[PDB]
């Protein structure tokens, strides 16, 4: 998932190395960054970002600080 | 893979020909359905249905509430 | 060859060789047609995205083009950090380009100047 | 070729690996129309039309409801 997504002045972008970054669209200043592993896809919805990796581990993070809300890995 | 969100559910398809609905609140499994083949596209949600296109060339629609297969084509 | 776009009843379509065209959505009549070669192909890959009287297209030669929707002439052309394989995203007067070598760049819609560059790969 | 389905006006559109396009009724899975024409690689939908592009960058406009070709340009 390499096309950047923009919601409310904030850019969410995924690097190949599983780095997920939230930036201010105007300045490019990083609001938050999470170092993850093997993230294949993500989506922004309401107050959360939902991610999954190749291991079918699914996470939710806050849209504000990229803070982990929950993790599901027993799929 | 692929992940989508609708109606209090996170939907995800897997290579293992499984589709999961987790609750957006806590990530607990709402439901789990075996599909006709490798689910290698984002699930697409519309009118209470979760559409799954498989590598198998099948197209299935699963009920949003319980995950039951409503129809299968191709 | 690339992803086509639709804006104000006009279909904008491009191919890898560099052919870009704008067609009336009602009858398919060609409003304009233009080539971004060169002979030597332009290798268009990222696009097409339409916004602000501009058609934005990225290429494998690390270029981002802005064409005028009016006549298909090149409004601007910007050297980016790596291959522009994704669809440009437009927001708040900025064109966002994710390059194949992990850079995220925001370019001005007006003149294509890179306003900022972030290394997404960087260990942090 | 993008394999993920698109839903517009209760109509599902699915492109297969071979460039075959199918339009199905969303509720029943009932096939409305199929075009096994060309190597279509991409499409975009608006109000009543779907615009297909092929490998040669040819563009065809079809009606969503009937799959009727309104025009083609090359
Ligand atoms: Na949500």
Curated annotation (Swiss-Prot), chain B:
Part of the Bam complex, which is composed of the outer membrane protein BamA, and four lipoproteins BamB, BamC, BamD and BamE. Monomer. Interacts directly with BamA. The Bam complex has the shape of a hat, with the BamA beta-barrel crown in the outer membrane and the periplasmic brim formed by the BamA POTRA domains and the 4 lipoproteins. Belongs to the BamB family. The chain holds residues 113 to 186 of 392 of the full protein. Part of the outer membrane protein assembly complex (Bam), which is involved in assembly and insertion of beta-barrel proteins into the outer membrane. Nonessential member of the complex, which may orient the flexible periplasmic domain of BamA for interaction with other Bam components, chaperones and nascent outer membrane proteins. Efficient substrate folding and insertion into the outer membrane requires all 5 subunits. This is Outer membrane protein assembly factor BamB. It is found in: Cell outer membrane. Disulfide bonds: none annotated. It comes from Escherichia coli (strain K12).
Curated annotation (Swiss-Prot), chain D:
It is found in: Cell outer membrane. Coiled coil: none annotated. Part of the Bam complex, which is composed of the outer membrane protein BamA, and four lipoproteins BamB, BamC, BamD and BamE. Monomer. Interacts directly with BamA. The Bam complex has the shape of a hat, with the BamA beta-barrel crown in the outer membrane and the periplasmic brim formed by the BamA POTRA domains and the 4 lipoproteins. Belongs to the BamB family. Part of the outer membrane protein assembly complex (Bam), which is involved in assembly and insertion of beta-barrel proteins into the outer membrane. Nonessential member of the complex, which may orient the flexible periplasmic domain of BamA for interaction with other Bam components, chaperones and nascent outer membrane proteins. Efficient substrate folding and insertion into the outer membrane requires all 5 subunits. This is Outer membrane protein assembly factor BamB. It comes from Escherichia coli (strain K12). The lineage of its organism: Bacteria, Pseudomonadati, Pseudomonadota, Gammaproteobacteria, Enterobacterales.
């Amino acid at each position: 998932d390499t096309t950047p997504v923009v919601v409310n002045g904030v850019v969410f972008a995924l690097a190949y190395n599983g780095n997920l970054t939230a930036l201010d669209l105007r300045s490019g200043q990083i609001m938050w960054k999470r170092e993850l592993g093997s993230v294949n896809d993500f989506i922004v919805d309401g107050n959360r970002i939902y991610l999954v990796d190749q291991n079918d581990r699914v996470m939710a993070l806050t849209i504000d600080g990229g803070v982990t809300l929950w993790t599901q890995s027993d799929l | 893979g692929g992940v989508t969100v609708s109606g209090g559910h996170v939907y995800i398809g897997s290579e293992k020909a499984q589709v999961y609905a987790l609750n957006t609140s806590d990530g607990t499994v709402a439901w789990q359905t075996k599909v006709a083949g490798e689910a290698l596209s984002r699930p697409v949600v519309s009118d209470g249905l979760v559409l799954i296109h498989t590598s198998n060339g099948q197209l299935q629609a699963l009920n949003e509430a319980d995950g039951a297969v409503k129809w299968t084509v191709n | 060859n690339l992803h086509p776009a639709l804006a104000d009843n006009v279909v904008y379509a491009a191919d890898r060789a560099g052919l870009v065209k704008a067609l009336n959505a009602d009858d398919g009549k060609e409003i304009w047609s233009v080539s971004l070669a060169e002979k030597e192909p332009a290798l268009l890959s990222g696009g097409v995205t339409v916004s602000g009287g501009h058609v934005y297209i990225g290429s494998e030669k690390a270029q981002v083009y802005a064409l005028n929707t009016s006549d298909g002439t090149v409004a601007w052309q910007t050297k980016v950090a790596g291959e522009a394989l994704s669809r440009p995203v437009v927001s708040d007067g900025l064109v966002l380009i994710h390059t194949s070598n992990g850079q995220l760049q925001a370019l001005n819609e007006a003149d294509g100047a890179v306003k900022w560059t972030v290394n997404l790969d960087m260990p942090s």
